[PDB]
């Protein structure tokens, strides 16, 4: 079956550019295996059904859930904890990936936790092993993300100057967490909020910043040429930074950086370190993740408001297909700075920072 599916996944390398991108998603609990922890179920539902699910809170909720898994794990009497535990956890991942592909944030967490299991001291006991790595996880949430965020915001807001005109795009909790700071530290500025179809993630950013008393300006991405003439700085929160210096964020992120550089505004990338990847992408199509095409059928200024369109039968009309990529890569010649918790670094300096953590002997 898997090999049979693997045969299918081969034939999906045809004329279409997006032949290889995986569309197989499970959005229900139908036919779930038994070895699936409840707290994992509630997660997999949130992954496939939420939409303002930042790449950070995912990694947190994934870990906090993983604690509950390990806490409730029970090794067989004929085998220590370390042996035969990833296998249990691996059987959890295979479910979660079938709900929505692993983010880069989530992935590196898996790679880290899978490691500490291996290096785990065998001469311990269960309750010794469990209680240990739960701190390792809680430490991972402390140092790698939460604290790192608090460093970035402070490090980012330092380069905010009185009289600026800030441009964000599509709700990055990090990028929101810095503007709200710059408000509370007394910086005089204002914000431009670029949004785009289909799930207008920008409104919730407009909602947040407005409720904090921030002068905001809201335009769709089609107005980038019109609106960039007022902007002086561009703030972007990434889903990941590649090893070549590229920035891997949502769709319009590339145009934002491009249109800005052709108007001499800086592209400031606020991204943590655990979202760095040893991989590289020459095009925004080899590695990506799709969204359902039906979401841009309901052409109106809404998405739940079931008001149809002309493309509702696209699944049934030949020579017609709708698609919506969720990410694209932005060349490093457009990214000006990366704001990691190691300070303001040039985006090209990513792989070193990756190799810096590999000091784990």
């Amino acid at each position: 079956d898997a090999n049979l599916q693997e045969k299918k996944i081969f034939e999906e390398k045809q004329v279409s550019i997006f032949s290889h991108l995986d569309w197989r998603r499970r959005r229900t609990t139908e036919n779930i295996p038994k070895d699936i922890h409840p707290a994992v179920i509630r997660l997999g539902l949130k992954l496939a059904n939420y939409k303002i699910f930042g790449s950070n809170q995912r990694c947190i909720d994934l870990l906090k859930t993983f604690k509950i898994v390990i806490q409730d794990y029970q090794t067989p009497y004929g085998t220590t904890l370390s042996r035969h535990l990833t296998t249990h956890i691996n059987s959890q991942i295979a479910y979660l990936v079938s709900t929505r592909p692993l983010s880069i944030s989530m992935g590196n967490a898996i790679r880290f936790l899978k490691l500490e299991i291996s290096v785990l001291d065998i001469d311990l006991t269960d309750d010794e092993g469990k209680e240990l790595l739960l701190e390792k996880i809680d430490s991972y949430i402390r140092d790698r993300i939460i604290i790192a965020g608090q460093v970035i915001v402070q490090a980012a807001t330092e380069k905010i100057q009185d009289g600026d005109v800030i441009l964000t795009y599509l709700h990055s909790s990090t990028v929101n967490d810095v503007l709200i700071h710059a408000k509370n530290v007394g910086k005089k500025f204002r914000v431009v909020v670029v949004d785009s179809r289909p799930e207008f993630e920008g409104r919730v950013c407009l909602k947040l910043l407005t409720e904090h008393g921030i002068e905001c300006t809201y335009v769709m991405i089609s107005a980038l040429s019109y609106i960039m003439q007022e902007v002086t700085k561009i703030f972007l929160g990434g889903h990941a930074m590649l090893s070549n210096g590229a920035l891997y964020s949502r769709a319009g992120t590339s145009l934002i950086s491009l249109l800005g550089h052709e108007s001499n505004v800086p592209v400031i990338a606020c991204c943590e370190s655990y979202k760095f990847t040893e991989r590289i992408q020459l095009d925004s199509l080899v590695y990506n993740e799709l969204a359902p095409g039906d979401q841009l059928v309901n052409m109106g200024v809404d998405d739940f408001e079931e008001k149809p369109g002309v493309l509702a039968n696209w699944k049934s009309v030949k020579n017609l297909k709708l698609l919506s990529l969720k990410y694209d890569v932005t060349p490093p010649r457009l990214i000006t700075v990366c704001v990691c918790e190691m300070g303001l670094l040039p985006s090209t300096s990513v792989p070193a920072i990756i190799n810096e953590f590999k000091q784990v002997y």
Binding site: S196, C216, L285, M299, S324
Partner: protein, 337 residues
């Protein structure tokens, strides 16, 4: 020098009523878009000529140059209004200067040219019901099987440009809905050229960059071309231009000639009019609409140094050769009306 400095409003209203009606329909956006305003403009100037009585060319030229300067004031950014006027003026000064010569060539200001100008104005009208048919032919020199093409929003001229190739050559097309304004027409267009046998792929306006890597050409329809070869295009088209330039992807524009204009884009903020913000944020979100600035630009401007080819009813021409169409189609006196 508008018309109010010549004829009282009621006189304007009684002499040439269609003018006063067309002014309202222009300011009220009752007549919209470049083509519809083009034909209606020429249709008006027909009656004008068929209703005005005069004796000299000068007094005639001063009249048409007066209604135009007011017809432009009505709604100016729809440039096709003036471009039909300027085309008429030269047509007169030409037709005058070629009959004025046949007189002193026979010997070795007459108002008879009325039905002649009308037979020249209608020649302009019949030329309009002909752009696309004259344009849809040049495709087979620029489209080829298995190629990949990008377009944005509803643009009939570009629609018929492709469908004429699909009847023979088989290829694929990527369409970016012109959110928020060209949304409806774009989807339907994608549906239409799908039936014509075009591997159609509809994308959100943000996936332009993500796919330009494997795109062969980008084909665009404009709202108007200006005296610097720059383009006034419907909303969101700089996205496809800047992404192309970043990929060394050629940019080709399929447009009629009536949208060409000699006005020089001195200040852009006087060009790109804005529409209602209803189209991007709903009225219900009352907390936001009160606390935020909501703007929906209608047009977009892409400078000329970005367009690689111009497909016109007269043929394919580089942007640097646009001037020799104006100086062959208009008259430099009538740049400012």
């Amino acid at each position: 020098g508008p018309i109010s400095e010549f004829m009282s409003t009621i006189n304007v209203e009684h002499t040439y009523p269609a003018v006063s009606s067309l002014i309202a329909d222009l300011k009220s956006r009752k007549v919209q878009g470049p083509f519809a305003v083009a034909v209606e403009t020429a249709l008006v100037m027909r009656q004008v000529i068929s209703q005005t009585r005069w004796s000299t060319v000068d007094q005639l030229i001063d009249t048409v140059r007066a209604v135009g300067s007011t017809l432009v004031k009505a709604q100016p950014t729809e440039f096709s209004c003036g471009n039909i006027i300027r085309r008429i003026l030269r047509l007169i000064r030409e037709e005058y200067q070629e009959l004025l010569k046949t007189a002193d060539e026979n010997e070795k200001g007459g108002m008879d040219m009325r039905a002649v100008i009308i037979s020249g104005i209608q020649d302009v009208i019949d030329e309009l019901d002909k752009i696309n048919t004259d344009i849809e032919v040049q495709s087979m020199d620029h489209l080829h099987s298995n190629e990949i093409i990008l377009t944005q929003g509803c643009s009939k001229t570009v629609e018929a440009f492709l469908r004429f190739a699909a009847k023979k050559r088989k290829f694929s097309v990527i369409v970016a809905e012109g959110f928020p304004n060209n949304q409806k027409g774009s989807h339907a267009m994608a549906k239409r050229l799908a039936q014509a046998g075009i591997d159609t792929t509809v994308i959100s306006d943000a996936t332009i960059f993500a796919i330009m890597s494997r795109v062969n050409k980008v084909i665009l329809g404009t709202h108007a071309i200006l005296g610097n070869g720059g383009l006034v295009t419907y909303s969101g088209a700089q996205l496809v231009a800047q992404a192309a330039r970043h990929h060394a992807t050629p940019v080709v524009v399929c447009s009629g000639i009536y949208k060409l204009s000699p006005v020089y884009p001195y200040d852009l903020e006087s060009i790109i009019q804005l529409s209602s913000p209803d189209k991007i944020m709903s009225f219900n979100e009352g907390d936001l609409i009160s606390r935020a600035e909501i703007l929906n630009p209608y047009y977009d401007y892409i400078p000329p140094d970005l367009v690689d080819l111009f497909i016109t009813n007269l043929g394919g021409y580089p942007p640097s050769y646009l001037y020799r169409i104006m100086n062959d189609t208009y008259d430099a006196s009538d740049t400012i009306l």
